Amino acid sequence: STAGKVIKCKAAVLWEEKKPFSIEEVEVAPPKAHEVRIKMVATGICRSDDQVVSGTLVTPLPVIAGHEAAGIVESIGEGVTTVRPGDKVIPLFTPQCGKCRVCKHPEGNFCLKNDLSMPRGTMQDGTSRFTCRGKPIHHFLGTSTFSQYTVVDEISVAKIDAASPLEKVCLIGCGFSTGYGSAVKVAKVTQGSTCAVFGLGGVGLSVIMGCKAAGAARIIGVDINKDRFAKAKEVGATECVNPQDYKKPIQEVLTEMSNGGVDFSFEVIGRLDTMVTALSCCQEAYGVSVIVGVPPDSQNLSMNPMLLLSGRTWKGAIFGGFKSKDSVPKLVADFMAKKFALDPLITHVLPFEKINEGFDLLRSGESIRTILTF
Amino acid sequence: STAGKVIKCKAAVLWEEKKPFSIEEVEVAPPKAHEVRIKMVATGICRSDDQVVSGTLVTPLPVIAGHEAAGIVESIGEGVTTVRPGDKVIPLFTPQCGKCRVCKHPEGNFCLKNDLSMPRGTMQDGTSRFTCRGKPIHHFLGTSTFSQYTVVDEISVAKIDAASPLEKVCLIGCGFSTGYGSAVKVAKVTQGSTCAVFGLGGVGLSVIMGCKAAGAARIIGVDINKDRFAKAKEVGATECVNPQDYKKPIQEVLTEMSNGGVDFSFEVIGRLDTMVTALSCCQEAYGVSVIVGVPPDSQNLSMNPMLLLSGRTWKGAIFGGFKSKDSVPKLVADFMAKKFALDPLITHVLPFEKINEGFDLLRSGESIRTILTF
Ligand SMILES: NC(=O)c1ccc[n+]([C@@H]2O[C@H](COP(=O)([O-])OP(=O)(O)OC[C@H]3O[C@@H](n4cnc5c(N)ncnc54)[C@H](O)[C@@H]3O)[C@@H](O)[C@H]2O)c1
Ligand SMILES: NC(=O)c1ccc[n+]([C@@H]2O[C@H](COP(=O)([O-])OP(=O)(O)OC[C@H]3O[C@@H](n4cnc5c(N)ncnc54)[C@H](O)[C@@H]3O)[C@@H](O)[C@H]2O)c1
Ligand SMILES: OCc1cccc(F)c1F
Ligand SMILES: OCc1cccc(F)c1F
Ligand SMILES: [Zn+2]
Ligand SMILES: [Zn+2]
Ligand SMILES: [Zn+2]
Ligand SMILES: [Zn+2]
């Protein structure tokens, strides 16, 4: 019925920075070769989507944002072989083309087809599938999940278990997997280690879950909002510290708590100063610090390279280092098997139509993750 | 007939920054408990010693510098068990106490008893065994090898093979091991990888030897001094590039040459700008960059953290990541077994009395390593 035809549906369009989303009718073109059109079932509100609104994460406007979602394939373009109409799917903000140097590397996951490094806001072919008020609307990271229907390149979608609860697993599309993988895959947290986690929102909580899963003996939560501490301890933090409580810089406090520095630190906020703090708080000879949070556009940090010379390792990762198309289905399967929990991350649920209230809850600090249902 | 007595001998004293060494008589006190007095046989001139003269590496003056050396034990203090008079030894600028948390960690080597982080310029007990002109002289990194005799703490000395050529193996005390281990132990260069080495002095050449030994398929030497290329190729470099030959920044050149970034980059110069450049030239998703060069005191670098978020790993190390007391005798054994070569690194061999000439060779770029003999 809708196959091969333009679909008119509602989407949350962001016409300008620092403005509310405008929920309105958009036209969604049918999928071209190697593209997939998806009816969205649920989508998470991630801090990154808000950074697009704030303008600290830069991507071309106007745009349909949203990148953490789950849905059902409405139709496929010519040539698609990995999903079919009716399949449950999670769109991948980091693609997996499977052919580039990175996809073929055993460790890398930042596929060269990503739209993150030099964002164009289009499909892989350099055009848009979205029209609103007669004007072309940009995509975001090849996903654009703030729409009843979106179109994504095949390399940016993964087929998941047919029995998956889409209102929970959308988190595997961003927040959960990013935090969990930062701990278990990127940092490679070891059994008996001490970890510090800067930022106790959805992603930071996921890092704590990964730290616990890996067998960390101590997991120190760091956040300026003490209301986050309860849930952090629930998912595995052994102690929580608020830097505003201390007269000395937090890296000194943590170094003292850990009796000379932590084995593993994680910056999960997106501030330049906390990236440097987190690197400093790891043990100077063998510590590892992982940058997860997204820094403000085009800003450089300043640091003393002697921090590195002594032995520290500093690294960052997108999407927890997971090769996206390979891992998402495996992660969903693991979820179905009760290997990890997602409920602790979801604090609010709202209809898609209340997306602006959802962003208000994030901005206010009230929610961890709000899931929007279509 | 010197054991237990003060020794009057010649040393090269640095009384002031930016001045020649003064070759003169000093008094060397006998070793106290757990100390070892060494008659120096050979000592290398390392860029780091020149950084002490330059004032860019800060340590209390006046000082007897020198940290890359080999000699023979003259006498030992009470309680020493790992060396005995007549033993061939290499002083270790990074000690191995074997009891601290770093020493007990499987990866770390920056022992907490080091005099590098916050230099005191003394023995472990906070005193000096050197007197010159009635004035106390500081030690340098617990070693001070620019003297016919020095006294070092037991944790800062390693017994080596009785048949070692001391005029060669002194390089295992700093230069060779630092470069070699940075490749094979810190970066863990993999077979068939592409490596880039910034700085083709003695340490950079040892990095190249390590990269070659690790099975790298391409090893790109980077230096502004084209005179270094020939030797770099002899020890394993496949290509050499001079940044001054190009109109575009060298990270762009290296990224193009390596079809998207190198696997492993090494900064072996000590410049803030080349540290960032070396990081940038490694592949954005899986590249690893190792800082080896010692940067100028108290200077911060500026960098865009997106370089790390995409997947890059940045680390540094002291002494090639080798746990010093454990590795040095093994490295010497390996040298005696012809597993690596040291002759390529030695370009000049001078009597100790010509130390200042030796330093002039380094500053002018004429030498790679000059070895001073006593
Ligand atoms: N690397 C990736 O692939 C990836 C994926 C998803 C999200 N992110 C990024 O991760 C970061 C965290 O996302 P999130 O959804 O958990 O965000 P969030 O806003 O829900 O959580 C951030 C937390 O940091 C805390 N915080 C703020 N300032 C702080 C300070 N000075 N010290 C300590 N804590 C402080 C806040 O109180 C909050 O609890 C964001 O920057 C987001 O863009 C990265
Ligand atoms: N991490 C450690 O344990 C350790 C140990 C020994 C030495 N070091 C440091 O390693 C560094 C190198 O030591 P070395 O003994 O090889 O010194 P060196 O002076 O022998 O070598 C420096 C090389 O860098 C090159 N160079 C200078 N400026 C450059 C530029 N802008 N671009 C490219 N190349 C440039 C020079 O031409 C020279 O060949 C020094 O900073 C030294 O202090 C560190
Ligand atoms: O939250 C998704 C995300 C992860 C990393 C970098 C981004 F820009 C981004 F939008
Ligand atoms: O060359 C020896 C050395 C290595 C690393 C750091 C230093 F300060 C230093 F002097
Ligand atoms: Zn790819
Ligand atoms: Zn996200
Ligand atoms: Zn130690
Ligand atoms: Zn040295």
PDB file of N, CA and C in Angstrom, chain A residues 2 7 36-42 69-76 83-91 147-152 157-162 164-167 374:
ATOM      1  N   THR A   2       1.608   1.515   1.067  1.00  0.00           N
ATOM      2  CA  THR A   2       2.502   2.672   1.059  1.00  0.00           C
ATOM      3  C   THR A   2       3.823   2.445   0.325  1.00  0.00           C
ATOM      4  N   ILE A   7       5.142   8.988   1.886  1.00  0.00           N
ATOM      5  CA  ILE A   7       4.330   8.947   3.055  1.00  0.00           C
ATOM      6  C   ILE A   7       4.306  10.319   3.709  1.00  0.00           C
ATOM      7  N   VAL A  36      16.089   1.868   3.445  1.00  0.00           N
ATOM      8  CA  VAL A  36      15.072   1.197   4.213  1.00  0.00           C
ATOM      9  C   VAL A  36      14.223   2.239   4.842  1.00  0.00           C
ATOM     10  N   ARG A  37      12.924   2.119   4.640  1.00  0.00           N
ATOM     11  CA  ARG A  37      11.963   2.997   5.285  1.00  0.00           C
ATOM     12  C   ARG A  37      11.335   2.341   6.531  1.00  0.00           C
ATOM     13  N   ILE A  38      11.406   3.042   7.667  1.00  0.00           N
ATOM     14  CA  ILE A  38      11.001   2.534   8.965  1.00  0.00           C
ATOM     15  C   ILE A  38       9.914   3.329   9.643  1.00  0.00           C
ATOM     16  N   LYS A  39       8.907   2.639  10.158  1.00  0.00           N
ATOM     17  CA  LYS A  39       7.874   3.225  11.017  1.00  0.00           C
ATOM     18  C   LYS A  39       8.443   3.141  12.410  1.00  0.00           C
ATOM     19  N   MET A  40       8.528   4.270  13.057  1.00  0.00           N
ATOM     20  CA  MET A  40       9.160   4.402  14.352  1.00  0.00           C
ATOM     21  C   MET A  40       8.145   3.961  15.403  1.00  0.00           C
ATOM     22  N   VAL A  41       8.632   3.189  16.351  1.00  0.00           N
ATOM     23  CA  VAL A  41       7.817   2.772  17.459  1.00  0.00           C
ATOM     24  C   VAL A  41       8.166   3.488  18.718  1.00  0.00           C
ATOM     25  N   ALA A  42       9.452   3.659  19.004  1.00  0.00           N
ATOM     26  CA  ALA A  42       9.854   4.391  20.177  1.00  0.00           C
ATOM     27  C   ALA A  42      11.180   5.037  19.920  1.00  0.00           C
ATOM     28  N   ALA A  69      16.548   4.858  18.803  1.00  0.00           N
ATOM     29  CA  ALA A  69      15.176   4.460  18.448  1.00  0.00           C
ATOM     30  C   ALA A  69      15.061   3.020  18.020  1.00  0.00           C
ATOM     31  N   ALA A  70      13.836   2.515  17.944  1.00  0.00           N
ATOM     32  CA  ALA A  70      13.539   1.199  17.449  1.00  0.00           C
ATOM     33  C   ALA A  70      12.279   1.317  16.668  1.00  0.00           C
ATOM     34  N   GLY A  71      12.165   0.450  15.672  1.00  0.00           N
ATOM     35  CA  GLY A  71      10.987   0.550  14.820  1.00  0.00           C
ATOM     36  C   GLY A  71      10.762  -0.683  14.014  1.00  0.00           C
ATOM     37  N   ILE A  72       9.850  -0.584  13.047  1.00  0.00           N
ATOM     38  CA  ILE A  72       9.489  -1.694  12.170  1.00  0.00           C
ATOM     39  C   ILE A  72       9.628  -1.279  10.711  1.00  0.00           C
ATOM     40  N   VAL A  73      10.284  -2.103   9.901  1.00  0.00           N
ATOM     41  CA  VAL A  73      10.507  -1.825   8.506  1.00  0.00           C
ATOM     42  C   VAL A  73       9.167  -1.707   7.791  1.00  0.00           C
ATOM     43  N   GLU A  74       8.946  -0.566   7.189  1.00  0.00           N
ATOM     44  CA  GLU A  74       7.751  -0.384   6.349  1.00  0.00           C
ATOM     45  C   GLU A  74       8.009  -0.895   4.927  1.00  0.00           C
ATOM     46  N   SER A  75       9.141  -0.539   4.341  1.00  0.00           N
ATOM     47  CA  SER A  75       9.509  -1.028   3.010  1.00  0.00           C
ATOM     48  C   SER A  75      11.014  -0.947   2.812  1.00  0.00           C
ATOM     49  N   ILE A  76      11.482  -1.677   1.800  1.00  0.00           N
ATOM     50  CA  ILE A  76      12.872  -1.680   1.383  1.00  0.00           C
ATOM     51  C   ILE A  76      13.073  -1.288  -0.050  1.00  0.00           C
ATOM     52  N   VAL A  83      17.312  -6.740   5.819  1.00  0.00           N
ATOM     53  CA  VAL A  83      16.054  -6.590   6.536  1.00  0.00           C
ATOM     54  C   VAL A  83      14.897  -6.748   5.528  1.00  0.00           C
ATOM     55  N   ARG A  84      13.701  -7.037   6.016  1.00  0.00           N
ATOM     56  CA  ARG A  84      12.523  -7.075   5.182  1.00  0.00           C
ATOM     57  C   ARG A  84      11.378  -6.330   5.874  1.00  0.00           C
ATOM     58  N   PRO A  85      10.373  -5.941   5.129  1.00  0.00           N
ATOM     59  CA  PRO A  85       9.219  -5.298   5.717  1.00  0.00           C
ATOM     60  C   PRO A  85       8.678  -6.162   6.844  1.00  0.00           C
ATOM     61  N   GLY A  86       8.248  -5.501   7.921  1.00  0.00           N
ATOM     62  CA  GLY A  86       7.819  -6.187   9.111  1.00  0.00           C
ATOM     63  C   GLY A  86       8.896  -6.544  10.127  1.00  0.00           C
ATOM     64  N   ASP A  87      10.156  -6.448   9.758  1.00  0.00           N
ATOM     65  CA  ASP A  87      11.204  -6.757  10.718  1.00  0.00           C
ATOM     66  C   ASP A  87      11.351  -5.638  11.790  1.00  0.00           C
ATOM     67  N   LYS A  88      11.661  -6.025  13.003  1.00  0.00           N
ATOM     68  CA  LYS A  88      12.005  -5.051  14.021  1.00  0.00           C
ATOM     69  C   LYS A  88      13.443  -4.619  13.833  1.00  0.00           C
ATOM     70  N   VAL A  89      13.675  -3.337  14.005  1.00  0.00           N
ATOM     71  CA  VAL A  89      14.998  -2.752  13.739  1.00  0.00           C
ATOM     72  C   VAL A  89      15.374  -1.567  14.581  1.00  0.00           C
ATOM     73  N   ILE A  90      16.685  -1.413  14.729  1.00  0.00           N
ATOM     74  CA  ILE A  90      17.276  -0.320  15.412  1.00  0.00           C
ATOM     75  C   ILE A  90      18.168   0.385  14.424  1.00  0.00           C
ATOM     76  N   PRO A  91      17.881   1.644  14.152  1.00  0.00           N
ATOM     77  CA  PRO A  91      18.752   2.469  13.286  1.00  0.00           C
ATOM     78  C   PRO A  91      20.097   2.738  13.955  1.00  0.00           C
ATOM     79  N   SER A 147      10.527  11.179  13.951  1.00  0.00           N
ATOM     80  CA  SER A 147       9.554  11.128  12.881  1.00  0.00           C
ATOM     81  C   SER A 147       8.826   9.794  12.903  1.00  0.00           C
ATOM     82  N   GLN A 148       7.539   9.815  12.603  1.00  0.00           N
ATOM     83  CA  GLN A 148       6.761   8.582  12.515  1.00  0.00           C
ATOM     84  C   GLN A 148       7.349   7.621  11.502  1.00  0.00           C
ATOM     85  N   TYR A 149       8.020   8.133  10.470  1.00  0.00           N
ATOM     86  CA  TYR A 149       8.682   7.304   9.462  1.00  0.00           C
ATOM     87  C   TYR A 149      10.016   7.962   9.117  1.00  0.00           C
ATOM     88  N   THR A 150      11.056   7.165   8.926  1.00  0.00           N
ATOM     89  CA  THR A 150      12.311   7.721   8.469  1.00  0.00           C
ATOM     90  C   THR A 150      12.839   6.793   7.450  1.00  0.00           C
ATOM     91  N   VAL A 151      13.835   7.241   6.723  1.00  0.00           N
ATOM     92  CA  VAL A 151      14.502   6.436   5.747  1.00  0.00           C
ATOM     93  C   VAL A 151      15.974   6.389   6.105  1.00  0.00           C
ATOM     94  N   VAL A 152      16.558   5.207   6.076  1.00  0.00           N
ATOM     95  CA  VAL A 152      17.944   5.058   6.443  1.00  0.00           C
ATOM     96  C   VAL A 152      18.618   4.128   5.479  1.00  0.00           C
ATOM     97  N   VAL A 157      21.179   0.293   9.674  1.00  0.00           N
ATOM     98  CA  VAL A 157      20.063  -0.314  10.315  1.00  0.00           C
ATOM     99  C   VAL A 157      20.416  -1.756  10.606  1.00  0.00           C
ATOM    100  N   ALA A 158      19.957  -2.227  11.742  1.00  0.00           N
ATOM    101  CA  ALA A 158      20.183  -3.571  12.164  1.00  0.00           C
ATOM    102  C   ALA A 158      18.861  -4.252  12.506  1.00  0.00           C
ATOM    103  N   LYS A 159      18.683  -5.455  12.000  1.00  0.00           N
ATOM    104  CA  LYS A 159      17.530  -6.287  12.303  1.00  0.00           C
ATOM    105  C   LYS A 159      17.714  -6.924  13.704  1.00  0.00           C
ATOM    106  N   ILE A 160      16.716  -6.783  14.565  1.00  0.00           N
ATOM    107  CA  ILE A 160      16.715  -7.367  15.895  1.00  0.00           C
ATOM    108  C   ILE A 160      15.592  -8.419  16.083  1.00  0.00           C
ATOM    109  N   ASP A 161      15.662  -9.170  17.186  1.00  0.00           N
ATOM    110  CA  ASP A 161      14.713 -10.246  17.541  1.00  0.00           C
ATOM    111  C   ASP A 161      13.262  -9.805  17.380  1.00  0.00           C
ATOM    112  N   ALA A 162      12.466 -10.653  16.748  1.00  0.00           N
ATOM    113  CA  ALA A 162      11.082 -10.311  16.480  1.00  0.00           C
ATOM    114  C   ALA A 162      10.223 -10.131  17.719  1.00  0.00           C
ATOM    115  N   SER A 164      11.269  -8.510  20.493  1.00  0.00           N
ATOM    116  CA  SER A 164      11.851  -7.454  21.318  1.00  0.00           C
ATOM    117  C   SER A 164      10.866  -6.369  21.730  1.00  0.00           C
ATOM    118  N   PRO A 165      10.914  -5.960  22.997  1.00  0.00           N
ATOM    119  CA  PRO A 165      10.132  -4.802  23.446  1.00  0.00           C
ATOM    120  C   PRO A 165      10.788  -3.484  22.992  1.00  0.00           C
ATOM    121  N   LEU A 166      10.297  -2.960  21.870  1.00  0.00           N
ATOM    122  CA  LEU A 166      10.909  -1.787  21.252  1.00  0.00           C
ATOM    123  C   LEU A 166      10.971  -0.560  22.147  1.00  0.00           C
ATOM    124  N   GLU A 167      10.062  -0.438  23.104  1.00  0.00           N
ATOM    125  CA  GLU A 167      10.076   0.725  24.018  1.00  0.00           C
ATOM    126  C   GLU A 167      11.215   0.699  25.056  1.00  0.00           C
ATOM    127  N   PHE A 374       5.347   6.468  19.623  1.00  0.00           N
ATOM    128  CA  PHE A 374       4.654   6.963  18.438  1.00  0.00           C
ATOM    129  C   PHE A 374       3.253   6.443  18.315  1.00  0.00           C
TER     130      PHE A 374
END
